[PDB]
Design a protein around this nucleic acid. Structure first.
Ligand SMILES: [Mg+2]
Length: 102
RNA sequence: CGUCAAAGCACUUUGCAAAAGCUAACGUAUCUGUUUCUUGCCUUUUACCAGAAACAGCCGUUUGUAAGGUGUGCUAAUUUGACUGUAUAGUUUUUGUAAUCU
């Protein structure tokens, strides 16, 4: 939409906020929630997150349920951990990659 | 204006109590009386004259508080008080130069 000026009042700030998820990079979380797709998320401490994303924030603060979480580290040994539900601060996100359900 | 708290709220009637503390208008107003002195006019008393000191009375004022009245409400209205009250991922704090090993 034709208002990326970044000098906006509240109504147009909200308009750009919704448009950004309508079409921008963060749009992937929208149809990831709607389609309930597998998403792999990596934190900044080299931790792996696979789960459904029930909801997400504009700051990418996402609530995750059914997380498949693995961390690696003696000899390199891979270990996993399943948590039913979690709230993730968008600060620690490095990447999200969607695994299409179909 | 905002958040929180408790109080129904606005107007009004009556009772009770208090009203200088750091020199200052309870009242930006203003009367009367008693006692003790000093005076004026004076034939004697009341009524008087005009100054002071110490006391009182009356016409009023303000605040607090208690119980009521009227009109509106409790399916909300208003008032009083308190408050470290506001946005914001793009360098000076809160949307990460992190993890890695030592
Ligand atoms: Mg005689």
């Amino acid at each position: 939409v034709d208002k990326p000026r970044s000098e906006l009042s509240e109504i147009e700030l909200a308009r750009l906020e919704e448009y950004e998820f309508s079409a921008g990079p963060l749009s992937v979380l929208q149809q990831a929630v709607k389609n309930h797709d597998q998403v792999l998320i990596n934190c900044r401490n080299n931790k792996k997150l696979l789960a459904r994303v029930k909801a997400f924030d504009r700051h990418s603060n996402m609530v995750l349920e059914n997380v498949k979480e693995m961390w690696t580290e003696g000899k390199a040994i891979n270990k996993d951990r399943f948590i039913s539900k979690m709230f993730l601060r968008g600060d620690g996100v490095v990447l999200v990659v969607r695994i299409p359900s179909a």
